[PDB]
């Protein structure tokens, strides 16, 4: 009953409050002041108040709120010592390996369960294969996504967070069928009034994340890459139609193609296919009954290619506005699609960063590409996505030689992660 929570962002804090209130674990958290001004402000803020706080916006989510203290906030990963039964990874998926590899042998030998909160497709494999050198029977659990939306209102008080939304449905799988830890997590979800479908494997759960299929076409195209890396004459928007945004028949086709390459990969692992339209429409953002035929939603996976694309395009067009918002007196609804692209930006030490979109999708897609090679499945759409992103990175370096740039601009990243997946797939 010690828990190590890797991450100090909003997600980590929400999760830490849940553990504090609903579990018997003594909770230690770990940041990275050694490489992050964000982490250092969190550490400094917690040191001062000796409290974290979760607020909510909608009283529907009361049970998530609270003020709490933890046992120990570690300033950096390398400081971690001792034994922990359970490790929770509330960092971004690209840091799982790099973070675990900094823990001590003593810590790593003690671990029974690693719980991955926002893994990509392939994360459990990386983490299981890694932890295997230290443990004979490591249990790894993957969720589909984090449970909701949590943020910091005020950058200067990053120990106070606000959960604004909770997802309707989440998925979870374990390396160990119907384990004690699965059942405890299931009982916890019930207590939190969150629906949780237990699926056969972590990989099954990792594939129930709409972002895997959608972010790459949306962000790794010429229109978007320009908006993020170079800028635009007038503001453009992620979810709008060309020329206001990237959405085009071309983009929708690239999405279908990527989805099918992913469905081929999933057939190899014998994981069920994902009805991308049903997911979008019944689990994410609803549309009016008049917009899409219920038969077309249900049968999406077996409909002709051109029809799958038409339905995706139509879906995106239907959420240009929030059709369930209150129209004003001129018949105008809330501009739900007016989401700006975040541009490349200088941190407070003048180092250029690439924003989460598409930083993190480069990692996800790079891993999907690598699984693909190892299984002998072709992924020409994936490949092109990655090529475009690499081009934009190289173009930025050539164009901004007087600028200090983060390691995100380098090639070829993720060698350790790739080696572990390679090894895991030789063994099964």
């Amino acid at each position: 009953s010690k828990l190590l929570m890797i991450g100090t962002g909003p997600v980590a804090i929400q999760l830490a409050n849940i553990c504090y209130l609903k579990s018997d674990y003594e909770i230690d958290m770990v940041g990275r002041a050694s490489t992050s001004e964000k982490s250092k402000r969190l550490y400094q803020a917690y040191k001062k108040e000796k409290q974290f706080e979760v607020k909510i916006q909608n009283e529907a989510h009361q049970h998530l709120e609270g003020k709490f203290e933890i046992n120990r906030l570690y300033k950096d990963v390398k400081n971690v010592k001792g034994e922990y039964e359970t490790v929770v990874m509330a960092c971004t998926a690209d840091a799982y390996y790099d973070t675990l590899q900094q823990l001590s042998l003593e810590t790593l030998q003690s671990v029974k369960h690693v719980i991955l909160i926002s893994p990509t497709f392939g994360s459990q494999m990386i983490v299981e294969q890694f932890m295997s050198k230290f443990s004979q029977d490591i249990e790894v659990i993957s969720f589909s996504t984090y449970l909701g939306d949590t943020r910091i209102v005020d950058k200067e008080a990053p120990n106070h967070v606000l959960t604004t939304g909770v997802k309707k449905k989440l998925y979870m799988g374990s390396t160990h069928s119907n384990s004690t830890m699965c059942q405890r997590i299931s009982a916890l979800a019930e207590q939190l009034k969150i629906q949780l479908e237990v699926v056969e494997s972590p990989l099954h759960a990792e594939t129930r994340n709409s972002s895997l299929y959608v972010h790459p076409p949306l962000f790794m195209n010429d229109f978007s890459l320009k908006a993020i890396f170079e800028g635009t004459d007038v503001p453009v928007y992620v979810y709008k139609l060309f020329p206001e945004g990237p959405i085009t028949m071309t983009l929708i086709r690239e999405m279908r193609l990527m989805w099918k390459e992913m469905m081929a990969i999933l057939q190899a692992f014998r994981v069920p296919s994902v009805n991308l339209l049903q997911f979008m429409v019944k689990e994410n953002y609803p549309v009016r009954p008049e917009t899409l035929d219920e038969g077309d939603i249900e049968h999406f996976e077996i409909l002709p290619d051109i029809l799958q694309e038409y339905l995706l395009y139509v879906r995106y067009t239907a959420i240009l506005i929030d059709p369930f918002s209150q129209p004003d007196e001129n018949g105008h609804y809330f501009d739900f699609s007016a989401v700006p692209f975040k541009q490349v930006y200088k941190n407070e030490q003048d180092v250029v960063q690439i924003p989460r979109m598409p930083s993190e999708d480069y990692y996800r897609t790079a891993m999907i590409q690598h699984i693909g090679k190892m299984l002998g499945i072709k992924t020409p759409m994936i490949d092109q996505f990655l090529t475009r992103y690499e081009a934009s990175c190289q173009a930025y370096k050539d164009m901004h030689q007087d600028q200090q740039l983060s390691s995100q601009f380098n090639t070829n990243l993720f060698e350790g992660d790739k080696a572990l997946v390679t090894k895991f797939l030789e063994i099964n």
């Binding site: 939306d149 992620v238 979810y239 953002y285 959420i319 809330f334 739900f336 699609s337 007016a338 989401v339």
Partner: peptide
């Protein structure tokens, strides 16, 4: 409020 917006698309996430």
């Amino acid at each position: 409020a917006h698309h996430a």
